[PDB]
Amino acid sequence: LGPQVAEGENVFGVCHIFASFNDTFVHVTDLSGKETICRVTGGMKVKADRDESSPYAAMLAAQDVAQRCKELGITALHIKLRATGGNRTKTPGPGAQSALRALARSGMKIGRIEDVTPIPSDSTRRKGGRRGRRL
RNA sequence: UUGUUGGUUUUCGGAACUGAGGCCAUGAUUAAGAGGGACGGCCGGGGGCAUUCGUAUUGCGCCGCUAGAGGUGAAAUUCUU
Ligand SMILES: [Mg+2]
Ligand SMILES: [Mg+2]
Ligand SMILES: [Mg+2]
């Protein structure tokens, strides 16, 4: 079902991983990124909203992305990790490691890894007020 | 400053204006680790006007795949074939 490639050569995809503190997205596209092979999220694997960002949920999602990518015919992935970005946090959420760990452990070749968190050159006011989120 | 009068022969001192002189060693303290100002080469997210760029947030159009997404201590209001 995949492309006709020599067995000494492999076909590359791009896995956009969006690891927030509320959910994890494992999204594999082609090199252009316009076409999609398989987007599974951490909320598609758990029943509780609290666990949508869990490392376990991120691992299970990465595993479904790995199987679909292989059956479609992807063999290697370029990783593009991102946090929420913008005015929000820049550290990737707890599911970032498990998703990338699960991809490598699922027999998925890894190409180039790069952080793509959108960083503002300063921007819109952040939510919370000047006194912040007084939790 | 002439005692027979008066005219005094008058002189007299002072007070103004004015010209030419000489003479004074002729006449201006210093340059504030006070200040002002000049100049010189710099220096600075100092101020005003115009201009340029940056990515992000939000919205929209097209395309892809898909059933969730979001949010939280947990949720729900909310968005969604
Ligand atoms: Mg969540
Ligand atoms: Mg959620
Ligand atoms: Mg406190």
Side-chain angles (χ1 to χ4, degrees):
Chain A
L1 203 71
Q4 326 300 313
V5 298
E7 282 162 47
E9 278 68 49
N10 65 16
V11 64
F12 263 109
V14 176
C15 179
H16 308 256
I17 306 187
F18 172 43
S20 175
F21 281 80
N22 278 350
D23 199 66
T24 314
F25 288 67
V26 184
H27 190 160
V28 164
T29 61
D30 79 314
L31 286 175
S32 69
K34 192 185 176 185
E35 287 267 6
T36 292
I37 276 89
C38 176
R39 177 191 56 261
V40 175
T41 74
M44 287 174 40
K45 294 299 144 187
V46 295
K47 306 172 181 175
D49 309 7
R50 54 185 320 165
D51 309 327
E52 294 177 336
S53 54
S54 180
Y56 190 48
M59 182 179 72
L60 288 168
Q63 288 170 345
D64 295 38
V65 180
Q67 188 61 66
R68 190 59 181 163
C69 284
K70 285 171 163 299
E71 73 199 50
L72 252 17
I74 303 296
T75 57
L77 307 175
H78 290 299
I79 306 299
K80 291 183 181 179
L81 183 61
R82 69 160 277 200
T84 310
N87 317 346
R88 309 242 268 251
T89 181
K90 316 291 191 289
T91 61
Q97 295 298 289
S98 297
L100 183 62
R101 179 67 180 271
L103 290 182
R105 284 289 296 171
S106 298
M108 204 78 231
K109 295 289 178 76
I110 304 301
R112 307 201 178 275
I113 311 170
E114 183 178 1
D115 177 32
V116 289
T117 302
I119 310 295
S121 315
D122 251 30
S123 55
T124 43
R125 188 162 172 91
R126 181 177 160 191
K127 192 190 199 296
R130 74 177 272 92
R131 281 201 285 168
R133 185 177 188 275
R134 303 171 303 280
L135 73 165

